[PDB]
Enzyme design. Structure first.
Site, PDB file in Angstrom:
ATOM      1  N   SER A 183       0.793  -1.244  -0.057  1.00  0.00           N
ATOM      2  CA  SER A 183      -0.117  -0.078  -0.031  1.00  0.00           C
ATOM      3  C   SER A 183       0.989   1.412   0.102  1.00  0.00           C
ATOM      4  O   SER A 183       2.093   1.306   0.311  1.00  0.00           O
ATOM      5  CB  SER A 183      -1.058  -0.014   1.069  1.00  0.00           C
ATOM      6  N   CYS A 184       0.274   2.178  -0.326  1.00  0.00           N
ATOM      7  CA  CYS A 184       1.109   3.516  -0.943  1.00  0.00           C
ATOM      8  C   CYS A 184       0.580   4.680  -0.027  1.00  0.00           C
ATOM      9  O   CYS A 184      -0.752   4.794   0.960  1.00  0.00           O
ATOM     10  CB  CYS A 184       0.729   3.971  -2.206  1.00  0.00           C
ATOM     11  N   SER A 185       1.471   5.536   0.581  1.00  0.00           N
ATOM     12  CA  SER A 185       1.378   6.823   1.200  1.00  0.00           C
ATOM     13  C   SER A 185      -0.047   7.382   0.721  1.00  0.00           C
ATOM     14  O   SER A 185      -0.252   7.845  -0.364  1.00  0.00           O
ATOM     15  CB  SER A 185       2.334   7.738   1.254  1.00  0.00           C
ATOM     16  N   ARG A 225      -2.866  10.918  -2.805  1.00  0.00           N
ATOM     17  CA  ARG A 225      -4.253  11.252  -2.915  1.00  0.00           C
ATOM     18  C   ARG A 225      -4.538  12.840  -3.089  1.00  0.00           C
ATOM     19  O   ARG A 225      -5.596  13.345  -3.562  1.00  0.00           O
ATOM     20  CB  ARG A 225      -5.244  10.532  -2.139  1.00  0.00           C
TER      21      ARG A 225
END
Ligand SMILES: CC(C)(COP(=O)(O)OP(=O)(O)OC[C@H]1O[C@@H](n2cnc3c(N)ncnc32)[C@H](O)[C@@H]1OP(=O)(O)O)[C@@H](O)C(=O)NCCC(=O)NCCS
Ligand SMILES: CC(C)(COP(=O)(O)OP(=O)(O)OC[C@H]1O[C@@H](n2cnc3c(N)ncnc32)[C@H](O)[C@@H]1OP(=O)(O)O)[C@@H](O)C(=O)NCCC(=O)NCCS
Ligand SMILES: CC(C)(COP(=O)(O)OP(=O)(O)OC[C@H]1O[C@@H](n2cnc3c(N)ncnc32)[C@H](O)[C@@H]1OP(=O)(O)O)[C@@H](O)C(=O)NCCC(=O)NCCS
Ligand SMILES: CC(C)(COP(=O)(O)OP(=O)(O)OC[C@H]1O[C@@H](n2cnc3c(N)ncnc32)[C@H](O)[C@@H]1OP(=O)(O)O)[C@@H](O)C(=O)NCCC(=O)NCCS
Ligand SMILES: CC(C)(COP(=O)(O)OP(=O)(O)OC[C@H]1O[C@@H](n2cnc3c(N)ncnc32)[C@H](O)[C@@H]1OP(=O)(O)O)[C@@H](O)C(=O)NCCC(=O)NCCS
Ligand SMILES: CC(C)(COP(=O)(O)OP(=O)(O)OC[C@H]1O[C@@H](n2cnc3c(N)ncnc32)[C@H](O)[C@@H]1OP(=O)(O)O)[C@@H](O)C(=O)NCCC(=O)NCCS
Lengths: 252, 268, 255, 247, 240, 263
Positions: free
Chosen positions: B164-166, B170
């Site tokens: 999963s990404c920071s 977004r």
């Protein structure tokens, strides 16, 4: 109460005025006013005026000019520079009123110059009519208590069948309040909507959110719309949007 | 060279270090480093550190904590306050670097305090170099296939399959991250995942949510439009939208319009 | 015969051979052969071989090469030139046999050059003349392995990763008697590669000269609509005049 | 706490029992129990039992029988007579209790006859049967622990989508019959063959009301007409799709 | 059969009848009969009658009343109580006959009382459009020629067809079906049936619209449940 | 310039001719020409001709026959034998001209026999196209048609069935009927604008792109229907009907290149 009494009120009002300037949009209402004015006063006593501006499309302007021509009226286009008013430029919740102010002022200038006794528009019996009343423009259909059903009735009896079935809506509604409208972003909104209509979606809004386009479609059309997603994405990006989106809530 | 030499280089580097602190995320790479460190040095000579923060989900932190315990490591959770750095809070293009600096600064403090000779991370084939953190898999020339080969040979089967990404990704550059809007984005993505869309992004544009889905799922998604609209509006968005380009826009286009989409994206 | 007995037979056969070359596709069967070879003889006495060719995708080749390495095998890629055989080029019902002959002939050369005592493939019990003529061994078949025994031994060995979507020869995209050429093969291969990249791992681009006829599983066609224009234009840029979707779905014809 | 601790609890419990009969359904849970029983106790001290009945599909029974052999168990099929109990046949909200009773009574009879110390089932944590040991539940296995231990053992083959008891397709107070059960069963089998492994054909006499996962309804449209004619040929007059989706 | 011959044939027939009552539904056909009758006989010799009832929507009654007044006819609404007839109430396969009976009896009573010589309808009780061999296309030609642009474009059917034969119609379940269909039309589906199966609603749509409908599945399920259905379903066979 | 000038140009031309024969297809253009001729010259001075052939569906021939009478014309149907000409039969790229050549010869025969001064057709933006002579574009035809109250014309525009066949393919009664029956079936499903392009054992269906999403429910029925009509494979053209007209500016240019590569 009858249509005949309403028509008579309209006829007598026109006869009394003798020479008129008609704000003509191509809608059925102003089509009815223009036809009655021609029949009662004669072509040399009626000037049909269609306003071109940045808030409405060239297509609606061209259609109205051709329809006035088709009815047998002398028609003249006039160009309004709405963006010169800071209330309109900055799209305040009051901007509609100032656009209406400038509109009726221009038609008054034209009427003063051609000897007209009044400016007429197509308002009927169903507020926003403050600008009209302040300039002295007469809505004879409203004065004669015409409701929409009487407009259709009289149009039918007069043999009018041709008018603009697509009611115009100021492009200001595509911009959030407090957002500055410019020549560039207005044209980008209109060009985006024109493309979407050409795809078979006559009811559409491209709402402007700076780098985001937010498309409103009737929800029952979204399933068919999918085939066009990528073409719409790239077209509207070439018009200057960074992101092209579909509102999940649909139109309005 | 061979896998066998690469393993031996890794073993010899660990033996020399004697006591290490391992930055553990639960991915396969840091799983391999932790398993190797434990096997070579023993449980009392290893500290695994799992960092929690506002930029990552509590679910991902809890999984990594449970995975480190499963390996038998003494594990220490630590919390980072990434939003105290103005580069991160204001989401500048170099924000990632300041997060790395703060991350490795905390790990160095932990390692200094427990007598470790180095911080190890799982990077394979930088705030790390300035901090003196060691990426032994990279030093021993491990590519992803060597990681998988050694992991299988060591019998490692459980790790995070979904890197999963920071949540920073977004938010547009220059947008200020807050506790509320991070939570708003995180809850929106969680709701969409719960509907059956495991690959999704909710991009934050103030009052607009711009949802990115793999394009082949958009047709299936239509049944949920109204529920998604009202849900994300209840999370605080005014407008809820679907990006017409989808997730990873341009990666699936034909050659010509993929170049066009890149010519546009590079103009911005 | 118990699974333990079938395994012991396989172990003894590997032990006797000492050194082997394994024809590895990445399927569960050859994965089991390769893993057993590795467990009994050691990595230094096993060479895994993956054949690349014009009739199969580079993606399946790349996956098999990665899988053999992940199992801990020394792996070697080899490229076959199937279109040099007129039987394969003319796409007749015996083309597969002539491809198998060139395949096993190449594997024999590799085995002779590295000192292997045999070529092993992953065939099990239930067109193997070319294998027999070439002296290649199917130890899973010899030891009475059926597909259920393969699954059981794979589970016992902890094998969980293999290529589950077995590739078929691109020749099936051309009607019998159509001459395969480098150009029309690349056209079909690139078209299918693009369609897979959109999220449709099961797809066929059937070649009807200037018409491409796309077969998709019917339950996926609704998902496809968003890609119509890009697929239309992509495949025309690959040389097709018309790009169509078969209303009958995947393997609509066969008749 | 750790997976290793829960596995060790499971190992010790099995060792104490020495000989078990395993209620095997083919799901991941009973697959894990069966494999563990075999690994700790050996094939000769484990009996796998697959119950066939009129309320569960013959396809799931055949898959489970084959999987039990694949895992290395001696396997015994047994057929349950659910409709011979009036409480089950008349389909009340208490029908579940009587079906569970008959299920565990049969397995207990089997286990008494082969000398097992207990019947084992695959119940997990997150509801207790007294006539059976749910060792995964006793060892605090969550679904995530089942999957992790399953992978560690190399188990990849199990029934990924249980169809569950066909009684749920009929309203409470409706009498189950062999004919209407068969009609529902054949309808769902057809829908599964089209690629919808999760589906219900709910029975409303002359109406079939199909439940699909909502994310699958868009794909289903290509099948509307074939499903309509198939389910009509099975005896429904009207074939419908529930707008609420599955559950 | 030129348009002129068909119009002249109808003109002469109306002229002969002198005084008429027009069964006016708001369709383009009865719109044509009413306009022609008014033009040939004069406003004071024509009465348009629009029937209100429980088997047809209030929206259709209001539109037809408004359209006839728009054309310039003296317009009279009449209320039929169809559910007082046991055949209609119990929805027999023969109910259609008894409904037509009350309708033409009411219009006959109205016409006798106001001095009309006949009841006229718009079928294409005499249908002079039918007698003059009018097809739908020539009806369209005269409508524009007379300046007609407004009529009821979606001709409804009797709500009885939403219930299986032998089902008892009630005020409540008619209102329930009618409300359900009004909601679905408001979503953009002008052709729809909500077929009544007690606790199950079975929606019939033209098959080519079912894909467009999916965006509405959840709102329609919950809307029609609030109207009293327990289960809300979509017929896989489509409309008819 | 104005619509009124264009109408006046048309009026003056008809008065000059006095007696005319009108090639009437039922389209809006030839409907406008026929109505104008009747209004200017009178019913006794106009003959409408509808040409039937093996390339024209009998349904469209009937509709044009009914519309011409509806307008008040004396109307006469005549059948051309297009398949008796080898250029049309073998569908050469020049087939269009020979069909038009045989078309105009028949109409000329009729006009000589009825004393007409010219044959008129509906061509717009020795046969006379008075709409083109009077500078009528599509917008002016629609505007004048509205002004005269014309409401009925063929909205699902007839084209020669020959356009469904590749150049060099021999047209036969069987394969023509196969195409016509396939298209009629698709129209009956609710797709009034459709082409079934004939590629021997392949049918390639063109639909307006905005309708393709709706089509999915009919896939299996259409596959089986068209196979029973004799096609082996039943396919949907991914480019749709009138490919390219709706694309963004770049890809419209791209598809215009692709199409031009086969000319
Ligand atoms: C009148 C005005 C103020 C808008 O109010 P509106 O009632 O929504 O406007 P409409 O489009 O219904 O126009 C009413 C009549 O104005 C006249 N009119 C409108 N646009 C015209 C134009 N471009 N040229 C000439 N006359 C025009 C016509 O007589 C028209 O009658 P019709 O369209 O029914 O035939 C508009 O003329 C203007 O200048 N700006 C728009 C401001 C606005 O959006 N107001 C919202 C209302 S609160
Ligand atoms: C590592 C970091 C500095 C980012 O750099 P990165 O190399 O791109 O990020 P990765 O997620 O690949 O981190 C690699 C290793 O860092 C360590 N790590 C990452 N997240 C961790 C966490 N929450 N707790 C402990 N160690 C962690 C692990 O050893 C991990 O190995 P893995 O492959 O097994 O997961 C990150 O931990 C950080 O501090 N901030 C991230 C902000 C960001 O967006 N960075 C983008 C980098 S271009
Ligand atoms: C075996 C062969 C002779 C044909 O017989 P077949 O049983 O019908 O073919 P299969 O695809 O089932 O191959 C069976 C075994 O051949 C071997 N094989 C097949 N393709 C192979 C390849 N590309 N490289 C190495 N070995 C290969 C494997 O041992 C395989 O076992 P498995 O796939 O069950 O694990 C086959 O080798 C052949 O003719 N061509 C190989 C395929 C190829 O040329 N290219 C790549 C395919 S993705
Ligand atoms: C198991 C049973 C007794 C009820 O228990 P349940 O919790 O509802 O059912 P489950 O599917 O969760 O069964 C749990 C375990 O029972 C065993 N079991 C279930 N069906 C079995 C079968 N046909 N054969 C053998 N063992 C079986 C397995 O160990 C299974 O584990 P797994 O499927 O997770 O691998 C059921 O098999 C029965 O006989 N009747 C159920 C009918 C009913 O209406 N139940 C409602 C309860 S919610
Ligand atoms: C007319 C009627 C008696 C039956 O005729 P129908 O063919 O089923 O229905 P139609 O709508 O075509 O009615 C024909 C004409 O009746 C008149 N009419 C119908 N409904 C009317 C109403 N509510 N008010 C006044 N006139 C009405 C109109 O002239 C109408 O012409 P138009 O609709 O073509 O413009 C019907 O109005 C009625 O009273 N009950 C319906 C009976 C029924 O259900 N029949 C089933 C047929 S098997
Ligand atoms: C006339 C014909 C040549 C069509 O060519 P076209 O002039 O480009 O066709 P249009 O669609 O513009 O029609 C022109 C007019 O021809 C006349 N016409 C065409 N087909 C006709 C028919 N079957 N019967 C009578 N008149 C007909 C009509 O006046 C028609 O007006 P419209 O616009 O209302 O259709 C046609 O009859 C033919 O023989 N083949 C059709 C396909 C073809 O290859 N045409 C080549 C000409 S470019």
């Amino acid at each position: 109460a009858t249509l005949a009494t309403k028509k008579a009120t309209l006829v007598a009002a026109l006869k009394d005025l003798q020479r008129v300037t008609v704000a003509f949009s191509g809608g059925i209402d102003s089509t009815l006013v223009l036809k009655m004015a021609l029949d009662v006063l004669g072509r040399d006593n009626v000037t049909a005026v269609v306003a071109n501006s940045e808030l409405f499309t060239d297509e609606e302007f061209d259609k109205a000019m051709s329809l006035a021509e088709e009815l047998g009226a002398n028609v003249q286009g006039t160009t309004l520079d709405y963006l010169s008013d800071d209330h309109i430029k900055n799209n305040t919740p009051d901007s509609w009123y100032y656009a209406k102010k400038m509109f009726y002022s221009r038609l008054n200038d034209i009427a003063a110059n051609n000897g007209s006794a009044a400016v007429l528009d197509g308002m009927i019996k169903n507020p926003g009519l403050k600008a009209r009343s302040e300039a002295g423009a007469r809505s004879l259909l409203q004065e004669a208590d015409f409701f929409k059903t009487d407009v259709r009735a009289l149009a039918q009896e007069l043999g009018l069948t041709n008018w603009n079935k697509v009611a115009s809506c100021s492009v200001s509604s595509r911009f959030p309040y407090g957002t500055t409208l410019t020549h560039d972003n207005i044209a980008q909104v209109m060009a985006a909507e024109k493309y979407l209509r050409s795809l078979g979606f006559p009811t559409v809004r491209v709402r402007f959110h700076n780098d985001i386009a937010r498309i409103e479609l009737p929800e029952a059309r979204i399933g068919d719309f999918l085939v066009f997603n990528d073409r719409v994405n790239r077209q509207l990006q070439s018009l200057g949007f960074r992101y092209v989106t579909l509102d999940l809530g649909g139109f309005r």
